[PDB]
Amino acid sequence: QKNLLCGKCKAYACSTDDIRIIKDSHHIVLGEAFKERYTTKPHKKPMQFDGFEKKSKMYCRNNNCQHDWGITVKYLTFDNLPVIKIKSFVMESQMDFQKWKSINSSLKNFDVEEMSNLYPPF
């Protein structure tokens, strides 16, 4: 439905249709195209209480920007899963993504069967 932009440089980030919510907290982004729009630096940690194993920090790929976009994690069998920092984004016009969430219907919940269809284990 709507597009998120990097809050610092305004480069296109992703669509709200791309976002899934895990455990009513984590905002993950579906699709391999999104991975073209950020870079990462390693920051591996063992599993935390909710089953996220941190792998990296995400940065806007605009080299003049490099805004903190979030982290990537492994959750279940899904590695390199981007978890966006919702404070880091604004909406295409200008309101920020946190404001937009507050006045819009809830985003779609994560569905493991949908995820498995998109990223099959074979």
Instruction: List residues binding Zn ion (CB under 5 A).
Output: 6, 8-9, 11, 60, 62, 65, 67
Contact in structure between 60 and 69 (CB atoms under 8 Å) = yes
* The two three-digit tokens of residue 13, written as one number: 């980030």
Total residue length of the chain:
122
Q: What's the closest the beta carbon of residue 62 comes to Zn ion, in angstroms?
A: 4
Do the annotations mark residue 14 as ligand-binding? no
- Work out how close the CB of 57 gets to Zn ion at its nearest, in angstroms, rounded to a whole number: 14
What are the C-alpha distances in Å from 53 to residues 7, 12, 76, 108? Answer: 26, 27, 9, 22
Consult the annotation and say whether 6 binds a ligand.
yes
We find the least distance from the C-beta atom of residue 37 to Zn ion, in angstroms, to be 9
| Closer of 59 and 119 to Zn ion (Cβ) | 59
